[PDB]
Amino acid sequence: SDVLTVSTVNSQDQVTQKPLRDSVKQALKNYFAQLNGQDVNDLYELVLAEVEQPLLDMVMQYTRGNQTRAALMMGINRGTLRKKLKKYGMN
Amino acid sequence: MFEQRVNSDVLTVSTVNSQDQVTQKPLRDSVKQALKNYFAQLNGQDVNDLYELVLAEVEQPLLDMVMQYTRGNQTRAALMMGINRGTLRKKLKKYGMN
DNA sequence: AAATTTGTTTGAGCGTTGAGCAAATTT
DNA sequence: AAATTTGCTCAACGCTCAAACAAATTT
Numbered sequence: 001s002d003v004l005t006v007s008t009v010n011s012q013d014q015v016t017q018k019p020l021r022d023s024v025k026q027a028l029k030n031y032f033a034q035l036n037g038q039d040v041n042d043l044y045e046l047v048l049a050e051v052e053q054p055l056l057d058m059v060m061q062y063t064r065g066n067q068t069r070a071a072l073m074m075g076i077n078r079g080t081l082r083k084k085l086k087k088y089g090m091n
Numbered sequence: 092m093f094e095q096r097v098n099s100d101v102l103t104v105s106t107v108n109s110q111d112q113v114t115q116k117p118l119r120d121s122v123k124q125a126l127k128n129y130f131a132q133l134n135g136q137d138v139n140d141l142y143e144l145v146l147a148e149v150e151q152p153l154l155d156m157v158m159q160y161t162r163g164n165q166t167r168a169a170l171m172m173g174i175n176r177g178t179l180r181k182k183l184k185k186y187g188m189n
Numbered sequence: 190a191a192a193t194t195t196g197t198t199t200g201a202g203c204g205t206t207g208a209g210c211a212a213a214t215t216t
Numbered sequence: 217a218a219a220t221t222t223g224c225t226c227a228a229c230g231c232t233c234a235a236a237c238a239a240a241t242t243t
Contacts, residue, residue: 042173
């Protein structure tokens with residue numbers, strides 16, 4: 001029922017899936033903790049970069065470099081894809 | 092005096108390594124793994140919303156956690172997120188955060 | 190009572206988009 | 217050699233944005 005999950009291990013060596021969104025939640029909970037109220041500025045772009053890079057990487061690998069297939073799988077325009085790829089020095 | 096912290100170690104997650112030992116790894120990698128397991132089970136439909144899928148999956152808790160941190164204050168939330176206040180109100184409505 | 194925040198409109202401009210076509214590349 | 221992909225144009229339409237204000241609220 002939930003499509004994007006990660007693997008976890010408990011203290012019984014049982015492996016169990018957990019939605020990726022809980023990882024994001026954790027990472028932010030931690031981040032917010034580590035700064036005793038210093039100020040945050042571009043949290044949207046920080047998280048977005050952290051997420052877009054590996055998404056591009058994975059689909060480019062899964063489609064063997066084929067930007068057309070990649071763009072189609074992703075639901076975004078091919079020029080947009082070329083744009084994001086360039087943004088991260090992936091070309 | 093200050094040790095470098097690269098951008099992939101800013102947002103991190105607890106993991107267990109090959110030596111049964113707790114250790115942080117980048118959120119990046121969580122995303123990679125989630126996508127790897129997505130692909131693994133993709134036997135064998137077509138996909139065309141992967142971007143919005145991942146986007147929703149990550150925007151929802153980001154909005155969640157910031158609204159918790161600014162105790163409901165949308166102005167502060169927008170400020171730390173670096174997006175405009177109107178678009179923040181928009182995203183919040185999108186995820187039923189009202 | 191003052192300061193801030195929300196909720197709401199502006200319209201400026203940046204960004205996604207499709208389509209289209211030849212050179213390059215893959216099948 | 218046929219089929220696909222790539223790199224690259226363009227201008228429509230959508231989205232993001234700062235700036236306003238009053239009403240509501242937090243302080």
